[PDB]
Write a protein that binds this ligand. Structure first.
Ligand code: FES
Ligand code: FES
Ligand code: FES
Ligand code: FES
Lengths: 147, 147, 147, 147
């Protein structure tokens, strides 16, 4: 299982989904971690009626875990209705910041469950969160067009 | 109209007017958007008597909308007397931050009216403003030589 | 002695030990000196039981003294039990910030004693500390996994 | 005179004296202008007894005026006793920030008098000061070794 999770992370690190900034988009955010210095620029696009995430595009520098996590994020939320995307994000963030007491559900997170073991390394939690909290922020800002 | 405005923006994105920093100049400003991380460095030059904008030069990174908007800015204000430039800037900023309730006048703004639809996307308003507020700031600073 | 210490520093500057960021790791820190503008990104890896420093990897820009000091740091602490690493760091920092009144012990510091003369140049003390305080910070953060 | 001063500035812009960071040095400072975004990294070296400026080395980005001014700085202060360097700096800064009421003396400043006309452009005063205030700061820090 430990070895399987490693393979998931390597798969997403080497074969990132949805990498590189694209247009169109509703909101861009730039998040820089104040501790490790790594950064993500992330864009969200919504459908015409604002109900679905139609694109998530991103660039930046980080460790393999943060790059893998942002890859997994895009695969889980693109095409999803906004409330569902938010639910996935809350599930992921609950899991990685639970200090190992919340295992995560693969039916919700998919490959996202591969980051369960990060929860037991406090200084690496930020790596899993960088892209996901950038998404939460960008999704909120893009959604303002539809309030 | 929606399709026409798209063409204006693409025209200015692909064929930017007045791009690249030049000398001489009266003031340079560096503006970085704290949300999206994009930036503009912008210079203003005034005539010998300080009554006309003789140059606006710029560099930086941004989305296609912000780059297009800065291109349009330069075309509208270069050669203009300072009070007129200020009037154009106020008209543009009124338009893009009106949430769609101010359509903008093409006789004042020219191609600037192509950014009317941005007003309905709160998270993209910053894109239209980046270069224009840099200009307002640089013009004010360059004008201090003539008070 | 003055000439010998110069050779140590040049040796580590030209032939850096352990340079370049590597995986795996427990914590990364990014430290930027607010005065000179130089920076280090530094990673620490601990053993499975968290008792030994198994890796220290780093990148960044600095003067030859700061680059040499980070090289020496890695050679002194990699393979060491955590309490011993901390003891070496405290000895080094005591030495360089003592204004020359603490000569340092080569049995503890090894090549680290070559930085004794830096202590008499207040504005260069930061150069010796940059990598060492980055290590102290990263080691502390990596250790949180084992509390 | 206006045309002569232009030639001085162009001469120093195209043929900078003492450009590029060098070792050894006593202090490095990194100054970033908060308005225009330009920056200088500047090093000072003093003699063994701390009485003379033996080197000033620098790098960074700026307009032609700021680059020319830093070039002129190095030519005026390198080889000078510290109190004399300070006197030159105070004379230069008095001149450029006097709003044109202090013409500057060529026997003190040399080519530095070419920046007299900058004083009448408030937004360009920062350009003349960037390198000179970096020097004042670095000289002070390097001098701490000799208090
Ligand atoms: S160490 Fe910076 S995001 Fe992982
Ligand atoms: S998203 Fe940064 S200026 Fe448009
Ligand atoms: S001058 Fe910056 S680390 Fe030495
Ligand atoms: S405009 Fe930045 S130093 Fe001159």
């Amino acid at each position: 299982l430990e070895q399987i999770y490693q393979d998931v992370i390597l798969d997403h690190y080497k074969h990132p989904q949805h990498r590189g900034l694209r247009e169109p988009f509703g909101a861009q955010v730039y998040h820089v971690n104040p501790i490790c210095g790594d950064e993500v620029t992330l864009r969200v696009a919504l459908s015409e009626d604002g109900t679905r995430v139609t694109d998530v595009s991103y660039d930046g520098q980080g460790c393999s875990i943060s790059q893998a996590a942002t890859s997994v994020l895009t695969e889980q939320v693109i095409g999803q209705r906004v409330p569902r995307a938010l639910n996935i994000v809350d599930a992921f963030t609950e899991m990685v910041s639970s200090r190992g007491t919340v295992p995560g559900d693969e039916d919700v997170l998919g490959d996202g469950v591969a980051f369960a073991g990060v929860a037991k390394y406090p200084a690496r939690v930020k790596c899993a969160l960088l892209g996901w909290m950038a998404f939460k922020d960008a999704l909120a800002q893009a959604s303002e067009a539809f309030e």
